Amino acid sequence: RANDAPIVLLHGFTGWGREEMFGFKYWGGVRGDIEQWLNDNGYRTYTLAVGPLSSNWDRACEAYAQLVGGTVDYGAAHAAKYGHARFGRTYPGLLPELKRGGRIHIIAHSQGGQTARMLVSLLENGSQEEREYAKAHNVSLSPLFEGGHHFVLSVTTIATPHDGTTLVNMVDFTDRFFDLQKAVLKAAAVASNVPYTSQVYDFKLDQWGLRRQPGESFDQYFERLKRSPVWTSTDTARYDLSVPGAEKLNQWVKASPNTYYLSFTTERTYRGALTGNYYPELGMNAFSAVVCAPFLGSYRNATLGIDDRWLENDGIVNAFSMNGPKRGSTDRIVPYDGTIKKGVWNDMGTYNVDHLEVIGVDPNPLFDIWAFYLRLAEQLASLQPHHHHHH
């Protein structure tokens, strides 16, 4: 070990706390419990749960308070712009050590990779618009928006749509996306047509004043959410997930020079010789395979900049999006050569695993999930806090 910074796990547009979903773990799913696996092997590991459907910003603010402790502060400018509450939940703080020079590695899956990047950006640089708004209106300002925080030694992204996913361009994306939430609920053996009195799956929609009501099944809940500002606003995961939304985000969310970045690309497809299109591989999660992959492997859009390079996918995200932000980005991406460089995206390669298989939510006995996350842990723990120059 060159370092002793704990690992923090972070989910995407689906994800829940360790105590949610009757203990079925987002990180591990039907395979087991990834956090616990890592801890047992001697790598300190924690798990964040933030709003699945919320924007990367809201999630960044939630991640921060959850780490250091306090009441989630979304920023006054941001809250005024989008019309939700400035303050959210209160958290004990997973690691108050952060307020004392300590650091962390973030391992992020799916859209959690956008969130992680933005958290690094906000920690380091704060928000100019938030600082000016506070100066002009005399409102208080969260320390997240002042700049100067150095918590993150590294960020690792796994199947992250850094340039968005063409999934959002499906004519029926709205129904299909919530069908995706019902699919993951099903995986954990939770029904979507039952009005469970227990919380089960909290979408943490406190800023929007949205919550599942007594006598409301997840089917009925999702129908309301579809018509709510968490689905219709630009301050949403839905928007950040799109190609143009991802590009917007990339235009201000830059790689920190003091931080290591690792990206893992995922795919579960084969190419058809006659069509040029990609198709779901045998074994891909049932839902992706019928619903999502055929579109992802065949959808082109000349004006949007979606060509052939975008067709390979993992059932949910186009592989070409995952190695790092590129569209609207100045971030650099360098293929892993054996030396993890800092201040750049280290493309660790492409793995034959579909979205949900990489976190164990879908079975794949051919994928050694434990060896994957352990090797990763070993790698992050070998990162040198400081690197001098040499021949």
Known binding residues are: 58, 78, 84, 235, 283, 357, 362-363
- Nearest approach in angstroms of CB 136 to Zn ion is 20
Which candidate, 52, 115, 124, 51, places its Cα nearest to that of 88?
A: 51
- Residue 73 has what DSSP assignment? E
Nearer to Ca ion, 30 or 191 (CB): 30
Q: Provide the mask over 209-228, with x wherever binding to Zn ion is found by CB under 5 A and - wherever it is not.
A: --------------------
- Nearest approach in angstroms of CB 383 to Zn ion is 32
Give the whole-angstrom CA distance, residue 16 versus residue 66. Answer: 14
283 binds, among Zn ion, Ca ion, none (CB under 5 to 8 A by kind): Ca ion
Find the Cα–Cα–Cα–Cα dihedral 147, 149, 154, 156, rounded to 10°. Answer: -50
Give the whole-angstrom CA distance, residue 187 versus residue 177. Answer: 15
Which candidate, 200, 350, 345, 196, places its Cα nearest to that of 264?
A: 350
Nearer to Zn ion, 63 or 158 (CB): 63
N-term to C-term CA, the chain = 23
At residue 158, the 3 state secondary structure works out as strand
**Which string of DSSP letters, residue by residue, matches 22-43?**
GG--TTTTTT--HHHHHHHTT-
Q: What is the CA radius of gyration of the chain?
A: 20
Separation of CA 259 from chain center? 18
Pick out residues in 2-61 that bind Zn ion (CB under 5 A).
Answer: 58
- Nearest approach in angstroms of CB 285 to Ca ion is 6
Can you say which residues are annotated as belonging to the binding site for Ca(2+)?
A: 283, 357, 362-363
Residue nearest to Ca ion (CB): 283
Nearer to Ca ion, 164 or 360 (CB): 360
163 binds, among Zn ion, Ca ion, none (CB under 5 to 8 A by kind): none
58 binds, among Zn ion, Ca ion, none (CB under 5 to 8 A by kind): Zn ion
Strand 104-109 relative to strand 152-158, pairing: parallel
Residue 281 engages Ca ion in binding (rule: CB under 5 A): no
Residue 314 engages Ca ion in binding (rule: CB under 5 A): no
Tell how many helices (H) and how many strands (E) occur in the chain: 13, 11
Give the whole-angstrom CA distance, residue 333 versus residue 324. Answer: 7
Residue 364 engages Ca ion in binding (rule: CB under 5 A): yes
- Nearest approach in angstroms of CB 357 to Ca ion is 5
Using CA atoms, how far residue 263 sits from 117, 274, 280, in Å, is 12, 31, 22
Q: Which of 283, 294, 328, 343 binds Ca ion (CB under 5 A)?
A: 283
Residues involved in catalysis? 110, 314, 355
Residue 235 engages Zn ion in binding (rule: CB under 5 A): yes
Nearer to Zn ion, 76 or 159 (CB): 76
Nearer to Zn ion, 20 or 58 (CB): 58
Can you say which residues are annotated as belonging to the binding site for Zn(2+)?
A: 58, 78, 84, 235
Residue 269 engages Ca ion in binding (rule: CB under 5 A): no
Binding site for Ca ion (CB under 5 A): 283, 362, 364
Binding site for Zn ion (CB under 5 A): 58, 235
